[PDB]
RNA sequence: CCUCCU
RNA sequence: CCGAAGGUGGGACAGAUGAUUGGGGUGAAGUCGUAACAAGGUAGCCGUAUCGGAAGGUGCGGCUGG
RNA sequence: CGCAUUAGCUAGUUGGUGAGGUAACGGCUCACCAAGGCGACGAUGCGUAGCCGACCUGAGAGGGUGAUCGGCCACACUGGGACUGAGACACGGCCCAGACUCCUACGGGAGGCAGCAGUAGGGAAUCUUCCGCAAUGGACGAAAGUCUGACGGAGCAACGCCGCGUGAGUGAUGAAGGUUUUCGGAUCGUAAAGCUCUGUUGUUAGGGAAGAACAAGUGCCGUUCGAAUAGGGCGGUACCUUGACGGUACCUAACCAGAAAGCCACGGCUAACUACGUGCCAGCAGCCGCGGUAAUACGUAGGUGGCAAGCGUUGUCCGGAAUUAUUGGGCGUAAAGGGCUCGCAGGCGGUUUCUUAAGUCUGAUGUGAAAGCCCCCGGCUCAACCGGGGAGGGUCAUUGGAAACUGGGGAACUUGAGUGCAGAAGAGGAGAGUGGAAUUCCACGUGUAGCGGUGAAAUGCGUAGAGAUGUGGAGGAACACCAGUGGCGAAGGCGACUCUCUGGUCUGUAACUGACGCUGAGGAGCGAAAGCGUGGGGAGCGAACAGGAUUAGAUACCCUGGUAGUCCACGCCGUAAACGAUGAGUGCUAAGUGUUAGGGGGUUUCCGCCCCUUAGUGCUGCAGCUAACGCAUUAAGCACUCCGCCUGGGGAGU
RNA sequence: UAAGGAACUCGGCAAAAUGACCCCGUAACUUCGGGAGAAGGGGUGCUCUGUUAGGGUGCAAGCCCGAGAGAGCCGCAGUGA
């Protein structure tokens, strides 16, 4: 672009999108408005628990929750961990990671916000699945 | 009024000489360039046009130039005015910048001394 | 005319 | 006199929600054909019109990226 | 600061004059006059936001943030108003209104946690209903002192940063002990086994901080006031007194290195592997990707580099990202040249000279707090920290120069750009008329059984005489040959002939003009084909539609018909692979060879040949360019000006 | 015609309400004309200033038309029917 052109119309940066939009909206009960607040986790209530087939080249029954958050946005979120952590309609905490297989699942259910197990007797970094170290 | 491209183009094809329409500052540039050792002489003729004489810059008198690989760039119509303090040096020496002043030109020392940075070349 | 999935 | 709040009125704007409806995206192994890629078996593609379950077909003009 | 998918806004609005008000200038308020003011340099509207010192990041340009700490601003349950005064149009006031809390024997009163603590609620999430004014600072008072949730402390919380550590050091059984197995092992490992040396700190008892300056109260002496020795105050000068933390930091000294190691990571990026159990299951995943019965990336089990009570996970920002490119990118084919003009604004502009001095440059002076980061950097034992002198800090003033360049004025010039004059070629355009060939239909003569069509057929047309052949008539449309990488046009386009009207280009000449130029958002115009409106026309062709075939089907291709349309006038539409997939202008940078329209010059009477030359139009090919293909004086080369456009694919040209 | 106000009724049938002039203001939608008197609001008597400003007629005197203001006055109510 000519300098004159750059003066007339400047450069425009790319708008980068958040990979976790649901954790960016707060809420107000009074005003009934979403607010712009950078949250690391959001509590929610499980509206549906079940399984879903992953995309190619994988096959599985990937256990997930449709969850209704405090901000009022309904997300899907992956129940992580080996063994039955699926749970039922109940309060849960959520996290920001996509399941590459499952299309739409952009959030994990945090293991440890309530009754959990995950992978018991983890080799190292024993803090990802709510695995209380035994003695 | 760009002698630089005329020079570059002829310099690329190792031309002996070139005829550039004369103007006061294009005359005063060719002499700055001549300070190294280009131009031997010109032929001032009966003036019909104001530049018909040309600059007749002859940087390739012999087969190969001892002063070869002439290169210039910094000549935009957007005006670039240098501070006497912040005058650049081409290649950290080994190259000159024709900094148009009210009274002076050339090196970094010829900026804080002379003053007006004005035009800036390479 | 067509030629399952990894 | 000015005057907050209040009342009345008709507009403006923004969000939520709504029977139903529209395409869109995505989804290991569904159905129908085979349009494109080879001269892809009628060279293809562009604009436009019209027709047809569906890809598409046909007209007119254009392009070669035949 | 964002949005033009916000373009008009304003009516005390804009200025005047007068009066009033105000600490104060002023449509600040009002009266009476006019008609202004603002806005493409973005008014107005909508959205978002306290601003700044700074902070995070980055080579820097930049980008992001504006908790804690300092300054300016604003606000004090919501909203309005004044009072008091030097000063609020009041943070713990009032007056009034509203929604909420409290009291009220109902008439009426009282209050505002965005003060410290705390509670509920919201939330992923953020403390003690603590002690003291000893210190520092306030307010009050002559002082003692009182009040001070300011402030100092302490409680809480790995939420950070960091301490100096949690020793040093002598010491090879390489034991014990581990999970593997080619039934053997090997490394931790001088570190521990066995110790044996020191107290940063602390494992338990004794010493004990600094922080405190004092203010005064008192005793004294020079000074100035003093009717004065009174009697105080103010300069030097004694004496005097007080600690929340707290019996807490720090020291000694034992019990004694005992109390003080951690978390994460080990495919590759990035230095770091094997058993077993699963068997596309269960599960994993930042990216690439692992698992379907031998998983170095999953479940478990045993095994190792960084930084150091944490580190994993998620969230936000900058970097990497020369990935919005000013620094510092692009657009022939990867995303990207507007279909093409005419042009308003704007941007940009040949040469000389003179003058000007806005820009440009430069000297000098003033400020840009403190903290922070940083230059010398010192002190506190170095530190995870505090002081001074500098520096940065300004598209900043003010003033004095310089004057090349950019800009302004004056005078010149002719190379750009036009004019004149003389030639040239052309399917450039608009209008009217005219011609020949062929198709079709109609009529008629001759003639008679097929014609037509396809891969092969059939539907069709024919004995109501087709087809063929001859003659004539009617009508419409398109212009064989000429015809050529030929011509003309801005592009779309333009092809029979003639006339009428009319645009541009090229060459030559330089008489004239004397930068009159280039580009050009928006705007206006033109713009293939198809389509649309009204009215015409309708031969041939032919979307649709029908029939015949073909085929599994055939809403296709092939055949036979055939409507709109194709044509004309006027109007509309505004798009095409509107392509050279290549914006316009200008200059510069090897050659060779065709061709179109000119010009000049050779010996020649021309023709003709040859040389040169301008403007097109092609081909080949240097240098250079390119991811490559290729481009290459008709650049995709080297430059400058201006415009348009691009920023992963989809979603969506929705 | 109290209070109510469509509960009436097949159905607001009938009745009530609205109603003049001046001023402000006026949406969807549209064939761009409209919609529109949309809707919704405000003013309205009398006196004085006042034979107002201004206009018609006329040589003048006069006669006639006549805003908009300001200050008042009265009533439950001013296009008082
Ligand atoms: Mg096909
Ligand atoms: Mg095909
Ligand atoms: Mg069809
Ligand atoms: Mg705000
Ligand atoms: Mg960048
Ligand atoms: Mg392509
Ligand atoms: Mg492309
Ligand atoms: Mg183009
Ligand atoms: Mg544009
Ligand atoms: Mg047409
Ligand atoms: Mg028509
Ligand atoms: Mg046909
Ligand atoms: Mg287009
Ligand atoms: Mg074309
Ligand atoms: Mg194009
Ligand atoms: Mg132009
Ligand atoms: Mg009644
Ligand atoms: Mg009543
Ligand atoms: Mg009823
Ligand atoms: Mg009834
Ligand atoms: Mg009625």
Swiss-Prot record, chain A:
Protein keywords: Antibiotic resistance, Ribonucleoprotein, Ribosomal protein, RNA-binding, rRNA-binding, tRNA-binding
Q: Does this entry carry the keyword Heme?
A: no
> Which Gene Ontology terms cover its molecular function?
rRNA binding; structural constituent of ribosome; tRNA binding
Q: Where is this site: Not modified?
A: 101
PANTHER family documented for this protein = 30S RIBOSOMAL PROTEIN S12 FAMILY MEMBER
**What does the record's miscellaneous section state?**
Many streptomycin resistant B.subtilis with mutations in this protein produce increased quantities of a natural (but uncharacterized) antibiotic.
* Family statement: Belongs to the universal ribosomal protein uS12 family.
Described by its record, this protein's role is as follows:
With S4 and S5 plays an important role in translational accuracy. Interacts with and stabilizes bases of the 16S rRNA that are involved in tRNA selection in the A site and with the mRNA backbone. Located at the interface of the 30S and 50S subunits, it traverses the body of the 30S subunit contacting proteins on the other side and probably holding the rRNA structure together. The combined cluster of proteins S8, S12 and S17 appears to hold together the shoulder and platform of the 30S subunit.
Tell me the protein's name. Answer: Small ribosomal subunit protein uS12
What is the scientific name of the source organism? Answer: Bacillus subtilis (strain 168)
From Swiss-Prot, chain B:
- Annotated GO biological process: translation
The terms describing its cellular component in GO are: cytosolic small ribosomal subunit
| GO molecular function, a single term | rRNA binding
Gene3D superfamilies annotated for this entry? 3.30.1370.30, 3.30.1490.10
Keyword Ribosomal protein attributed: yes
Does the keyword Hydrolase belong to this entry?
no
UniProt cross-references to HAMAP family, sorted A to Z: Ribosomal_uS8_B (MF_01302_B)
Q: How does it assemble?
A: Part of the 30S ribosomal subunit. Contacts proteins S5 and S12.
Indicate the family of this protein.
Answer: Belongs to the universal ribosomal protein uS8 family.
What protein name does the entry list? Small ribosomal subunit protein uS8
Question: Which gene holds the coding sequence for this protein?
Answer: rpsH
